[PDB]
Design a protein around this ligand. Sequence first.
Ligand SMILES: [Zn+2]
Ligand SMILES: [Zn+2]
Lengths: 114, 114
Amino acid sequence: DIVMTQSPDSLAVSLGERATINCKSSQSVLYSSNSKNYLAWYQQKPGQPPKLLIYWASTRESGVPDRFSGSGSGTDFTLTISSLQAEDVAVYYCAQYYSTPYSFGQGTKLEIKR
Amino acid sequence: DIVMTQSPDSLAVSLGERATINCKSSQSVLYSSNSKNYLAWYQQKPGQPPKLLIYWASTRESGVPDRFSGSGSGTDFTLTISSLQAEDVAVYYCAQYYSTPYSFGQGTKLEIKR
Ligand SMILES: [Zn+2]
Ligand SMILES: [Zn+2]
């Protein structure tokens, strides 16, 4: 399976600050036939299942705020939250749906200082 | 990682018929401390990313119709669609979020005869 490695494991920050998290895939998820990145980000709030946040590396899922921005390509991706809000506190996972079994990184937990 | 094995690989059916698909995990996803099954089902329509359908083995995600029913426990789960509708045609994946890396089965493609 393709291995997804994220960093940092956990990120502490205060409300309103910018947050950036990285993700690297053991092999490229950029398909040479259509130039699309089969890379998604899922948001997992405490005690909840992972919910789709972003896909195609940079496309936002219905209902996701503009403050969330996915970028990167090939094997290196990044999720950026320009100004972290209270409702954004959760563990974020990058995942590849390039080839089965689709796989997840081990996540980055975003907390608010304390 | 926990291995998720689904069956059948593909299921053909006509509009309105009942559809049942199975999923087995290589190890139990029933947590003995709270008796919850960290098992979810994701729906992947053609050309789209996997979207949350059911979690906690039987709880429906916001917006999911009553015709979808998740059941099972431990290592054996089942997704049942009482009367398949046109919009339900897609590949369904079971996934465990019991322990990282969260993993997906290789899916079951539901098609409408032809
Ligand atoms: Zn592997
Ligand atoms: Zn394994």
